[PDB]
């Protein structure tokens, strides 16, 4: 991913304010609510029967933390997303066979969650920079499909 120093600065600054314990769960949770077929990949996670059950599910919150951590790992090394995500790509593509459109969906759900949290501060230029990041992450996750 090619971010200008200005774009990287904007992205990094905002991410420093992102709740490590909650935002990943909010994103994963909304993925499961907004695109319900994605629940098929999380049978073992217990109760996903209603929006409240999904968002309150401890395993969703806990798994969300790992997802956010991976986005964080991506931000730490934007010049090597492919290498950073190689093991995750094998998992999501070769093992789980997640259709890669869903990678794009989760990235865009995360963007919605950032907008929800930060309001006016999530300006169109800040969004544009984040779209480069989540597109890069989706592409890296889908690398074993390419």
């Amino acid at each position: 991913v090619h971010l200008t120093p200005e774009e990287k600065s904007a992205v990094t600054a905002l991410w420093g304010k992102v709740n490590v314990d909650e935002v990943g769960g909010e994103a994963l949770g909304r993925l499961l609510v907004v695109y319900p077929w994605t629940q098929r990949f999380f049978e073992s996670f217990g109760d996903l029967s209603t929006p409240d059950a999904v968002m309150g599910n401890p395993k969703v919150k806990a798994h969300g933390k790992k997802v956010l951590g991976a986005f964080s790992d991506g931000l730490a090394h934007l010049d090597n997303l492919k290498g950073t995500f190689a093991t995750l790509s094998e998992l999501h593509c070769d093992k789980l066979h997640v259709d890669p459109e869903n990678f794009r969906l989760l990235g865009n759900v995360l963007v919605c969650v950032l907008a929800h949290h930060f309001g006016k501060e999530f300006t169109p230029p800040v969004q544009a920079a984040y779209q480069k990041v989540v597109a890069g992450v989706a592409n890296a996750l889908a690398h074993k499909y390419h």
């Binding site: 929800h116 930060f118 309001g119």
Partner: protein, 141 residues
Amino acid sequence: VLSPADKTNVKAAWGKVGAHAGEYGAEALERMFLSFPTTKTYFPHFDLSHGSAQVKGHGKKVADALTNAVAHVDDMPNALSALSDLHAHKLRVDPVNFKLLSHCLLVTLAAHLPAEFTPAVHASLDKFLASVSTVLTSKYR
């Protein structure tokens, strides 16, 4: 296909836009043009600069069209037939672009309506915009 709950959620949430229609619509377009620059190709003679009065005017049209869609949510192809002919027949907009604008509309609503943008309402709004998109990208005359 929208559930009864989806229709209730959309009517309630979109109903809060009100006189901010032009503002929100314009912001969604600006977000789209900036985040996804290929979309600008459909507007070759527009002023697409930040704060452009032309984008503000176009934002109001898009938002008013969504208001129209809500008021006819059970019979949208007949209500949006003119917009379908424009976008599908005349302009031949690639369907992917509707996903991009729909996402930018969700981002805009999330940024302005934090109390309203619950996971359930988020889901209903996404389905609504996908339905509108399917109508505008279809040729059914």
